[PDB]
Symmetry: D2
Subunit: 88 residues, 4 copies
Amino acid sequence: PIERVDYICERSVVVPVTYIRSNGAPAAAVLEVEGKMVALQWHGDLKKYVAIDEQDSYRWADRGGQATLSHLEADHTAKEVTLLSACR
Amino acid sequence: PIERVDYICERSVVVPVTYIRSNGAPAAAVLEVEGKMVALQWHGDLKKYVAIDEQDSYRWADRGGQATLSHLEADHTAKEVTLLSACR
Amino acid sequence: PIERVDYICERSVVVPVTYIRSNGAPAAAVLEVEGKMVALQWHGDLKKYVAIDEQDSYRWADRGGQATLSHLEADHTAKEVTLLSACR
Amino acid sequence: PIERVDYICERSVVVPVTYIRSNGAPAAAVLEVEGKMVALQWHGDLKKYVAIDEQDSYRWADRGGQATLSHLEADHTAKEVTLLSACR
């Protein structure tokens, strides 16, 4: 299943998302944020999508009506930075 | 499998693509073209990805080193319009 | 004067434009097309805006309700390619 | 004068900017951030460019090698939010 969902975040920022499912389960999300196309893979353990690029580790948490785009710099001192809190 | 591929087309136009595979086979492609995020599903019969939106029916043909972005307006008189011929 | 105008072209392609005027006259246009920010300068002789980058010579013709995005490759054999015919 | 400058910010975020000058002085900046084209006018008093849209009041401070994208929500309780700290 392929589903296009547009999210509207603070400052009227639009985050377009493509969700890709496989056999009932979340598998992939692709989104456009900060001028990048960000491919993310579902992480059932973290219950969040995590960018496939370890260098540029966006995370996208789908919580139904709401969603959160965060980012973790690739550093042990780095903490997850919430970048946007979205609504579809 | 999730794979980010960037394509460079005529006029140095960059088409970012996310390919999503399922059990060895192509399944989905997501690309950014003409300022849109375009979700496409693999069509084995047409051996091309076809937008999930019948209204805005981009097609993306992956031919290895080269790729073609086309579009079909949703009309019986409409013919496939080649929009870009890409290289990765 | 600075004016944001959004144009809707074929395939529902949106071309956002910023027009910059100086002392009553057109001076600059900035648009987003083909994933690029394209800065153009008014050419009174050609009555069209011409990209400042001679390498990537978009032209934008403002004809009121309608507008045309064209491109000229930097070659003597090259002819102006109409890329989009827009409406605001 | 029309000048294209690309800025690289945190998370490798690229902010393309067009600066428009008039008779030696800054006048306008157009940038692409958060998926928007943002037209800004120079404010000599604030020594920063301020979006022409009072609703979506990005500010862009050009400090030579470095630059800052901020935003002010249109509310008396709102404080300027630094969104990015850029380098050209």
